Design a protein around this ligand. Sequence first.
Ligand SMILES: *C(=O)[C@@H](NC(=O)/C(=N\OC1(C(=O)O)CC1)c1csc(N)n1)C(C)(C)NOS(=O)(=O)O
Ligand SMILES: *C(=O)[C@@H](NC(=O)/C(=N\OC1(C(=O)O)CC1)c1csc(N)n1)C(C)(C)NOS(=O)(=O)O
Lengths: 395, 399
Amino acid sequence: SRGMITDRSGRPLAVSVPSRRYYPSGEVTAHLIGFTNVDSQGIEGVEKSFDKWLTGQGAHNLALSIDERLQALVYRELNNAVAFNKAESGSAVLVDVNTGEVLAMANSPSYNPNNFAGTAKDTMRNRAITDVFEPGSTVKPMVVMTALQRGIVNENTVLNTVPYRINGHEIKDVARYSELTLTGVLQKSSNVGVSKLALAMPSSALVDTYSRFGLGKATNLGLVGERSGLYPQKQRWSDIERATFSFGYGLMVTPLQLARVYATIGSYGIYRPLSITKVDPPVPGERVFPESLVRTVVHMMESVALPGGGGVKAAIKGYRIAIKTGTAKKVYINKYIAYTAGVAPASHPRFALVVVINDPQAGKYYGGAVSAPVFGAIMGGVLRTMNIEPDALAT
Amino acid sequence: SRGMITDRSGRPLAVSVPSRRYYPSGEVTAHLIGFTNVDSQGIEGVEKSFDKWLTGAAHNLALSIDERLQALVYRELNNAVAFNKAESGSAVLVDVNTGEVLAMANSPSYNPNNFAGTAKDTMRNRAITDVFEPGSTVKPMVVMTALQRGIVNENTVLNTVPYRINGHEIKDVARYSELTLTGVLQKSSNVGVSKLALAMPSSALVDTYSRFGLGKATNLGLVGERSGLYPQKQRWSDIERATFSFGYGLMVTPLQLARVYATIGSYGIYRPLSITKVDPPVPGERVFPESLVRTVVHMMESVALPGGGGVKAAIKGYRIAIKTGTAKKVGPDGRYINKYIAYTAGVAPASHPRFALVVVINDPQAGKYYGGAVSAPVFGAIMGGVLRTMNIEPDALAT
Ligand SMILES: *C(=O)[C@@H](NC(=O)/C(=N\OC1(C(=O)O)CC1)c1csc(N)n1)C(C)(C)NOS(=O)(=O)O
Ligand SMILES: *C(=O)[C@@H](NC(=O)/C(=N\OC1(C(=O)O)CC1)c1csc(N)n1)C(C)(C)NOS(=O)(=O)O
């Protein structure tokens, strides 16, 4: 008599069979759904967080925000990229930018909850809500928004981007560019450009912006192990600290937290609470940042996926996409977190997606190289499955 | 440098990327497709079988597989193996009209994008390397043979009371004093089929099973493909003749069993199997009279209807003609052991079969083991998925 867990259209994701739980999508949705005791008590995932409701104490089924179609194609691309790259793990989160609904939440490696007794404990725990990594360059769109808002730069400002040092600390870019446009700063992911941008604003500037986009804040899905990251509450910020903050050092985020950042970008500055339950719209959320300013930086982000930008391998024929790649050293070692985060379609964003691939060991590790292809594969599938009409005008 | 392997509609299943081999369906199609070594040479599955073709131009290769069908087959099978705590499972789906293998899946699987140290025994393609005794899945051929020889007619009632011959007990799961010929299949009456077999020469059933391809090579060219264990005895004891009629004394691969049921589905037309896309007309050869097979296919519908052992395979809106099976496994000392193979084999839709499906679950250990309890729900979920995906018009008629 246990409540049946379904996706947002009623597709069964956990069901009692005459009694035993059966999970029809098995390892595709294992971390989110969780599993139960022999007492049919929930001990992981939604099975645990909604156990009282599942027991009927509060018909008592549960329709998640998940779309199983999207969950399956997300898992397929993610799991096989983690294998192909000999990575420790990967996480992918897709969010509806209008509603805050988690449309997909996948991790690799996964396990089969229909028979989990032998699975390694660490494999069982979800990584999209418990793993915390430094976000790296995925914060630079928030840097650019801040600098514009504070009028320290203008839409077409050209920045000098030659490298330099703060107190002996060398600030350099992947490739050397004398100068870059504001767009170019994002397009080439210029640590110099962002660092110079940060150095002309108080230390509080970026600390406010990142929080407004939800970094350092709880995700509030109510899932066990859910994690809020570490976020800097330093009273005084050092010049090196002030500069490395503009490209993802000194704070730590879960994949879910990052997905919410990009859902707030996608909505042009409306912060919406995440949900794992199907949401009946509208959801008002909070206007955390001016729409015109976010709108402008979203357009600048399209250059990341065009020739010349670092995430061009995420390009999808027919659709504008506004993305940002990242690469972060793990804690420092010669092992890396490969990031691609983005919204689509860029003309009117519907979906925010983050792809995080942890410790790729197949010879390649740069975000644009490792997870940008996966972003394009996933988001291309999402756009088709959701009948989104193409975005790119023939030229 | 290396051709692409695709499904029958061009979906990529093995692709070279700048280079390295990548498998977009990963573990879903692992056993069939196989993998390459470091120097991009195939060493398992299609990658090896077609290695020369794939690497003069490097040609792409369109399998008969439909990735949509492969995925839903693997989904049901893999979760059923896990749920049942089974050693393994195999599922094969064959196009009744062409012989094309539309899906071929096993569980447990592995990810060919990183086959690091997965057990050798997880990486072999059990659909073609596992041999099990087919048990009651052979029974439709017994009835066909008995009808052809005129020892029974379509409406004969058989005494199915339990009896012992030469010290061996012949008994049904449930006891029934008598059964129609349809009842014999509906209830899977060892008693009934044993009496049909004993009224015929030993060569009768040996010949029929062979005409449906048992004991014959499957000929896919895949590494490790097996042909089974098939009797070549001149002399048969009465007990051997009887147990042969409920599937003792021979061992088949899941693939071989699927060809049997494809041959049932075509109403007696035997067709070579194919894992490459075929240009559609495949005439095959008639091996048994159409009317007789048609008659037994209708009889087989009772297996999925109230009173039949495979009722849990029922699919709303579609007629299906199936046979369940449960066989004692032969242990490592050559004697039967307390472990089982759970079978369900069948064709759909029963009005005009298009698909043959076999589901084989090896050693379920979660409290159930009979084919009707273990494999039949899996057959139903898979085939219902197949019929919908292929846009088959419902055949069920409201009553
Ligand atoms: C943006 O992510 C930015 N990343 C960095 O500066 C970091 N590491 O880069 C190094 C690497 O070899 O990958 C160490 C040089 C970084 C920030 S926080 C953290 N824990 N590690 C660069 C590399 C400029 N662009 O990354 S990209 O994917 O946009 O190309
Ligand atoms: C048909 O498969 C028939 N099965 C048998 O006679 C066999 N074993 O039956 C036993 C069991 O496991 O229940 C051992 C008593 C058999 C044939 S060949 C082989 N190696 N083992 C029945 C009993 C009718 N199967 O039940 S069914 O409803 O699945 O058809």
